[PDB]
Amino acid sequence: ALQQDATPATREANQALYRKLPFADKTDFNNAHQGFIAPLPPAMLKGAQGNIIWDPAKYDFVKEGEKAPDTVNPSLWRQSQLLNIGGLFKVTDGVYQIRNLDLSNMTIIEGKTGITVIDPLLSAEPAKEALALYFAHRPKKPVVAVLFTHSHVDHYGGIRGVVDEADVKAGKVKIYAPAGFMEEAVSENIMAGTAMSRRASYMYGNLLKPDAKGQVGAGLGTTTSAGTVTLIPPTHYITHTGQQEVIDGLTYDFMMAPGSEAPSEMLWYVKEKKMIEAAEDVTHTLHNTYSLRGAKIRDPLAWSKYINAAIDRWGNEAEVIIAQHHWPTWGNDNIVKLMKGQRDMYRYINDQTLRMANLGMTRDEIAANFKLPDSLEKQWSSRGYYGSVSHDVKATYVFYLGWFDGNPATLDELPPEQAAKKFVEYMGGADAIMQKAKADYQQGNYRWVAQVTSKIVFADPDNQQARDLEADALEQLGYQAEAGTWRNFYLTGAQELRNGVQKLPTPNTASPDTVRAMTPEMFFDYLGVHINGEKAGAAKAVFNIDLGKDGGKYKLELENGVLNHTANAVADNADASISLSRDTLNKIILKQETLKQAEAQGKVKISGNGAKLDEMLSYMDTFAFWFNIVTP
Amino acid sequence: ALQQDATPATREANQALYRKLPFADKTDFNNAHQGFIAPLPPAMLKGAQGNIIWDPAKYDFVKEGEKAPDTVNPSLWRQSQLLNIGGLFKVTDGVYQIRNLDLSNMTIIEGKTGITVIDPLLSAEPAKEALALYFAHRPKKPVVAVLFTHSHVDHYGGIRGVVDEADVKAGKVKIYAPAGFMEEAVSENIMAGTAMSRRASYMYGNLLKPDAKGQVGAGLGTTTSAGTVTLIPPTHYITHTGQQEVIDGLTYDFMMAPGSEAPSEMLWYVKEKKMIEAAEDVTHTLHNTYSLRGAKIRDPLAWSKYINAAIDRWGNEAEVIIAQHHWPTWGNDNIVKLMKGQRDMYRYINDQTLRMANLGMTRDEIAANFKLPDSLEKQWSSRGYYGSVSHDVKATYVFYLGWFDGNPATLDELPPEQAAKKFVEYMGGADAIMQKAKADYQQGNYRWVAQVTSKIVFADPDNQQARDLEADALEQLGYQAEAGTWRNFYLTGAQELRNGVQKLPTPNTASPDTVRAMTPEMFFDYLGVHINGEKAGAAKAVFNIDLGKDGGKYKLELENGVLNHTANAVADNADASISLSRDTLNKIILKQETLKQAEAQGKVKISGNGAKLDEMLSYMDTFAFWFNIVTP
Known about the structure:
2 copies of one chain form a homodimer. Chain A is of the alpha+beta class. Chain A contains 23 helices and 20 strands.
């Protein structure tokens, strides 16, 4: 089928929102263009081959002055043109940012000796063209210190595109991260990785075409970079909310996330610049509450209290605020106005969800009856371009109560494919449903049209008349979607409903630096996820692993279709004892080497019944990427 | 209230489970009867106003020898007759337990000077009689120390029914607890308290009659006591996995749960008795993963590693294991066997749910294709009597991925009330659904019958003919339910359709010891949850709270229907300033006094616009306990 135009119902709904929000307030466009020095270099970025790492003109069709197309939400169109305002910018005296060279920004602070780089993007190569752009318009100076606001891959992924590890190991450069950086940075997307990355293709529009009926943006940033993920273990750690550090003569007043355990989130304030580093916490969008790789950040109340603490502290004298994802704000009364609204927003999501949940309302009907106060709804900085008030309220309900709404009629519901066939039966077959869905599509009830038509699709994936009608309803819901994430999910579902899943390349896997940072317990947990519990449910096998002076000894127990691991343990009844170095284990994880070769070359000694080890490894499955999402 | 008999489909499903499990293995009954000394006093434990705190004959119809009724699942009935084996028991030389005087047990260990009490039950009155039943068969000695295993009301609720706080301050009694006991103990059922306690009435069958057609047990125990909930703050804290303590001559080797820097749960090993304290973490049921009042404990993988760490430690020399629930185990071979089967189950739940997730399966689909190995299926200690495999597996998906399954047709559905009206319309009305659902009922498809019949009831709560057919299907699903919590949920739901919800009294919310331990920030958060965000959206007020030495000052900013609070701050221009003692505030929180009554006695002074305070307080709703669960 073909991509349809906007229906009268969609145009009317988009037009109504265009007259609801303060579109006349061009304050954001003025802050975004402020301090502009130079645009981004014109050409794309490639790795060894022609694989595209970044395209500085992927969303050129989102012109700054042009009216929103009938197929794009007028609010998302405004954020997307505000988003593509990119280049090298000057925030204030001696601090500079490179925007729209990734999903996030890169901040460069100048000191007495050299420069300080903050959040060196998700990949090394975009971080390189960003630093080379800064040095194309400012004096050449050494990189003295690097900072990590969060402990996630979109904050540290390009560390060695800006600094050298030999200079970090030689003490020439320092890296500052929160105390629990290493424990949080590794665990981001390891256990549910394949499910998340396939979900991410829907989320960031990688399967869509950048035009008025497809990809347009992601809200928090334009799109993600696809280069090399790099990691250097930090050298200096911030431990408490009252800590202070002197970086190149500049005083950094820090503040850890709500005094939890090994805090992984960080906010600071340069006293001389009067500048708050908002990280991802104070941005110009409602946040998803998760990270780029699915790791959760915090709950709405903790987010709101995190901001309220940063208002009582620094609020009376702060004159600059910068973030990892958007443009700065320069007025003190403007900055407090911004934080105050962000603070109240997250507490409203938290407290009003708990109120209606205590009143007996279920997850979906709380999100329906959720009305924002007039002063918050009109704020541009809290529009759901990345997150969404709808699914954040639903997520807040599932935070306090379970997945279960309490109604026993939903405790053991039928699975999607079983229920669909029973739904189609009770509605009199596909043709009967089609006759009524076609009439609900005229009225613009695309949410309900998409819902019943999916029952036909899940009861019969071969019904192309239904898949096309569901895609049509999915497309209009995407045309009205204000969230770049919601729009990408809707249009990709419409794409794979008309055409089917496309086996595109799968941008490799884990990088050598993330596997190096990976801990042995995680690798053993990683192995247990691949064990087929059905095939291995009757097997028993015990192994001993010795990783030497860089890892230690581990006792592995396979039983009940389960792979347990215990550190600093040796089993006398081990079917086989394996002794290899961590470097040899790393390149085996990187698929750079096989276990069969490393054993034959003497890199792995397997003492005992080697047949048992091969038996366990045959119980392990492989995770195919392109699995069905919008279809069974 | 005409409750049906078991259908042929229900009898088939239950009998199939009988030929599936090792019912001939009566090992659990031997350990349940081991060490019996005396039964519980048959007299009921009545409250001050004649209320029932505990009934020792509540489940006398659950006889150990007789066969399970057709309306009770045979596996659950076996667990329920095991649960009613209560009284004073001897475990090993010098330690004793009282069982079935509460949902949990009370352990008493004899030292050189007196006795040591562990987990003094849920209420003071049962704990008082538990200590009396012990002293009815043992030399009278003073209680020397008290240990809390978890930081929840389930474990400390009856501390002062066993100990006097005067002797605790005078050093005559030491109260041991995990490091972060106080922070975790208070933040349980405060925010979503109303919703959870109402859902709890479904879970523990308090609205059902104790007979074969209704309430048979709660799996983890029979039921909960309804007495005075008390709390005395601990005196000695356990902080690390290596810490050792000599308590009344006996050596305790503690182990902390990993994850935080001040955990709230702990296990220990009494060296001189070769005994492991297993808490709730190694019992004879699959656990809910949450606590008694909703606060979550662990994910399945953390639960597995918790047991596994307690296996590496203490594993090969333990000769006795006791728990806060169920019966001990004595053979060292049997102890490791019990712990290993408990460990591998929770890892199986975690690792196998992530495997099917990475294969693209959704939450409800994973639970439907989830199958255990035969070695785990036969274990009695892993059967789902409290928690269940189905509901633990679904919660594990939500633990890693969100509530959203990825299908865009689920992202923005209709609320349950609007979707139900549209579903019934597409199905040709209620009577068309009824005729299909009546036939489905006779075919045994009770899960699907309750699902669509719920659409009728949510579209028309006054359709008593549908509420009956849904009740019939919910009733058969309860007769087949292996979990006492699921059975109570299914049967309480069917009861509230036939007769509706009968607003019987109220099951007591908070007690003075619980609120007195709350922090001022908690009361302000508790207040912000009650703010009706739509009556107070346009409202604006700033208040100053001063608690003096016992609390300090607080600035209460109130805009956008949001109650912000900031610690140790004053508002330069506030509507009113309130100064009162924390002891007076606790009287206002507990609804013993009001701020108008307290002000009429000079305890609260208000300097400013008191009528503005009266306005903002008028915006707060009262949470009705008896809200609708099975109907809108």
